[PDB]
Amino acid sequence: QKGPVPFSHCLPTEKLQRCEKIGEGVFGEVFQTIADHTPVAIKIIAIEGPDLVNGSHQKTFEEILPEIIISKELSLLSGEVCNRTEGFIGLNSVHCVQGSYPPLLLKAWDHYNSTKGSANDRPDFFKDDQLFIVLEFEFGGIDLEQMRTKLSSLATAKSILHQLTASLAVAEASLRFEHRDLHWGNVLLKKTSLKKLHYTLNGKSSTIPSCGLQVSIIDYTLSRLERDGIVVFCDVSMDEDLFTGDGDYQFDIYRLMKKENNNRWGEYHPYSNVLWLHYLTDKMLKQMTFKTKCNTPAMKQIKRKIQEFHRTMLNFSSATDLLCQHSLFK
Numbered sequence: 001q002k003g004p005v006p007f008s009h010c011l012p013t014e015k016l017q018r019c020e021k022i023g024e025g026v027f028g029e030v031f032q033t034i035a036d037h038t039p040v041a042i043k044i045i046a047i048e049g050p051d052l053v054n055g056s057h058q059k060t061f062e063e064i065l066p067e068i069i070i071s072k073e074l075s076l077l078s079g080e081v082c083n084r085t086e087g088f089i090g091l092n093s094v095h096c097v098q099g100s101y102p103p104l105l106l107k108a109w110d111h112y113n114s115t116k117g118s119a120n121d122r123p124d125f126f127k128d129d130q131l132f133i134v135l136e137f138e139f140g141g142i143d144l145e146q147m148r149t150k151l152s153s154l155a156t157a158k159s160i161l162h163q164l165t166a167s168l169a170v171a172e173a174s175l176r177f178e179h180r181d182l183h184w185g186n187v188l189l190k191k192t193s194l195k196k197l198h199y200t201l202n203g204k205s206s207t208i209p210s211c212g213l214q215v216s217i218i219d220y221t222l223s224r225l226e227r228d229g230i231v232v233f234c235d236v237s238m239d240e241d242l243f244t245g246d247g248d249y250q251f252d253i254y255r256l257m258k259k260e261n262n263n264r265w266g267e268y269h270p271y272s273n274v275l276w277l278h279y280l281t282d283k284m285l286k287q288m289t290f291k292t293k294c295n296t297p298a299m300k301q302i303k304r305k306i307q308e309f310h311r312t313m314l315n316f317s318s319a320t321d322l323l324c325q326h327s328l329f330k
């Protein structure tokens with residue numbers, strides 16, 4: 001395009017100085033910083049190099065592009081008309097950067113390592129020819145897993161499920177979207193002053209009581225969508241390890257997706273979104289713990305309705321089917 005830029009292009013000194021690490025994986029470090037008084041999240045991925053990072057080869061640009069494309073398409077839903085949702089993490093910009101890792105980022109990396117501990121290599125070995133993709137996203141808050149003991153009540157749980165269901169439905173309708181890896185580390189929660197959140201599905205607008213939280217979906221490692229019959233997806237048909245996990249219902253969902261799609265990952269099977277929503281519902285009922293339990297009639301009723309959702313939702317064919325037809329959302 002206009003060639004790689006230096007890190008200073010995306011992260012000028014003041015923005016670098018305000019970086020705090022907030023997350024990691026094999027193929028991405030994520031930092032929070034502040035620009036124009038506003039928090040943002042910065043995801044940085046080393047690309048195109050020959051050598052190992054975090055135990056695996058670096059993605060090429062062509063290998064990571066699908067996930068950037070998916071990010072952008074889902075972000076763009078916030079500005080659409082017939083199918084509109086703000087429930088995917090908003091993408092502000094994408095740059096290809098060249099250079100050694102900024103010493104100021106290493107300081108932030110070290111602080112996270114000392115306090116939370118890292119599975120990753122200390123990123124101090126990259127040379128001045130190293131390419132990276134730097135993605136700036138809106139700040140989404142903290143993941144659901146990390147909020148295990150932090151939510152107010154099962155009313156909050158209902159809002160979260162409703163938000164996720166609406167977002168996935170809008171994406172099914174617009175993009176024939178499947179998330180395919182929507183475990184509780186990929187659902188982000190942040191405070192909102194809005195009492196109700198707004199979405200539009202096939203031209204019909206409606207609202208969701210927020211309970212003070214806004215949900216953002218993240219991580220498109222395994223996601224699938226299409227436009228004009230061009231399908232963007234991660235082909236895991238030859239992956240062995242993804243389907244052999246144990247110890248958590250999460251790992252059954254990979255197997256159940258493979259059963260549903262006959263190991264054909266290019267196809268559209270929006271049932272996979274139902275499977276993830278059931279897994280999240282299961283987490284809400286079994287692993288989340290709330291500050292206020294259902295100590296009244298109205299609250300014991302919400303508990304009952306979420307229990308019924310758990311028992312019935314797998315008989316729906318899509319997030320769209322669930323949103324439009326399930327008694328929980330009436």
Ligand SMILES: COCCOc1ccc2cc1OCC(=O)N(C)CCCN(C)Cc1c[nH]c3ncnc(c13)N2
Binds near residue numbers: 139
């Ligand atoms: C090619 O990229 C496609 C988009 O993928 C992502 C966008 C935004 C993300 C995470 C994304 O993928 C997963 C990933 O990179 N991790 C390091 C694991 C999760 C780290 N989170 C939870 C850190 C986090 C906390 N508050 C946030 N506010 C916004 N975005 C965040 C985070 N992460």
